[PDB]
Amino acid sequence: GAARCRVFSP
Amino acid sequence: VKPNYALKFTLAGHTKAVSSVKFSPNGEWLASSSADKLIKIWGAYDGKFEKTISGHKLGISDVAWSSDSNLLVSASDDKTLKIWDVSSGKCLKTLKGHSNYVFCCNFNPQSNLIVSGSFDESVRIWDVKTGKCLKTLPAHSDPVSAVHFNRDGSLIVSSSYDGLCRIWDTASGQCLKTLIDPPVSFVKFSPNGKYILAATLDNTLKLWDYSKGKCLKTYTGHKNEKYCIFANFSVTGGKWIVSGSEDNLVYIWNLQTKEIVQKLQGHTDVVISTACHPTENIIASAALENDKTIKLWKSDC
């Protein structure tokens, strides 16, 4: 995956 | 007056969620980046696939064009950025120094600098020619969702899950303004550089006078609680605000009245990214895992 394509949190 | 964007092309070929789409400044190309580790180049007017650019070892969260449309920069979960020569597809530089996912990136207008934001909570400024990190700004206390240069490259705006938007002097690296008033999932300067458009994960977009520290407009009606969805100023026809949504729609608002003027239906997952063509009334939109496609839309105004 890619971080933008996952839910945004620390 | 309202736009009448209509679907023109659906671009398939990414094998995981798309993360971002950007039109080249010269209007000829659309670039898309994906969780599938690839960049794809498409014709902006005919939708025709042009090429695949590869080399990142993990997925890509963002891609951006140089001002002359000759270079691309990509930000990856592999903790690097890559600078690519578009015509050849070769990786020209690998930008190393972030200690976690690189989330967002942009060239300055001069295109001698790249700005990047990362899960490592830092904003980095890089020299394009040498590929060396010029500055590491301890910008935020949580992941950085967006970084953007203003019209002359003298300022950078950053946003973060920590809830802040910060305006930075590019040359000195000093913070000149903090809009401290929810996680901020996107920010960018207005085309004239006087305003910033900030998305927060409470289903809200805001237009701010950052010098005044005053919120001038709020845009709502869409769903944005989970993802860092791109937003845009549309200036080729009517003056619109454009954004993806977590209800699988593209939303278009009148910038001044804040009314929703159109909702574009057809995507089957979160519309993570939208882009507005620099000269024609064309929108590109792109969506997550259940959809994996890019759609091009055109309007008469």
Author numbering:
A (entry chain C): 40 to 49
B (entry chain A): 31 to 211, 215 to 334
The authors write:
pmcWDR5, a well-established core scaffolding protein found in histone methyltransferase complexes MLL1-4 and SET1A/B, was initially characterized as an epigenetic histone “writer” to recognize histone H3 lysine 4 (H3K4) and is essential for H3K4 di- and tri-methylation (H3K4me2 and H3K4me3) to activate gene transcription. Two separate and non-overlapping sites located on opposite surfaces of WDR5 mediate most of its interactions with binding partners: an arginine-bearing cavity located on the surface known as the WDR5-interacting (WIN) site, and a shallow cleft on the opposite side referred to as the WDR5-binding (WBM) site. In mice, methyl-CpG binding domain 3 isoform C (MBD3C) interacts specifically with the histone H3 binding protein WD repeat-containing protein 5 (WDR5) and forms the WDR5-MBD3C/Norde complex. The residues Val31-Cys334 of WDR5 are visible and consist of seven WD40 repeats that form a seven-bladed β-propeller structure.
Here, we determined the crystal structure of WDR5 in complex with the peptide (residues 40–51) derived from the MBD3C protein at a resolution of 1.9 Å. There were two WDR5-MBD3C complexes per crystallographic asymmetric unit with a root-mean-square deviation (RMSD) of 0.140 Å between 277 pairs of Cα atoms. Nine residues (Gly40-Pro49) located at the N-terminus of the MBD3C peptide were successfully fitted into the electron density, while the last two residues (Qln50-Gly51) at the C-terminus could not be constructed due to weak electron density. Structural analysis revealed that MBD3C utilizes a unique binding mode to interact with WDR5, wherein MBD3C Arg43 and Phe47 are involved in recognizing the WDR5-interacting (WIN) site and Tyr191-related B site on the small surface of WDR5, respectively. Notably, the binding induces a ∼91° rotation of WDR5 Tyr191, generating the hydrophobic B site. MBD3C Arg43 directly inserts into the WIN site, located within the central channel of the WDR5 β-propeller. Furthermore, the guanidinium group is sandwiched between the aromatic side chains of Phe133 and Phe263 within this cavity, leading to the formation of cation-π interactions. Moreover, the aromatic ring of Phe47 stretched into the WDR5 hydrophobic B site, forming by Phe133, Phe149, Pro173, Ser175, Tyr191, Pro216, Ser218, Leu234, and Cys261. It is noteworthy that the sulfhydryl group of Cys261 also generates S-π interaction with the aromatic ring of Phe47 (48).
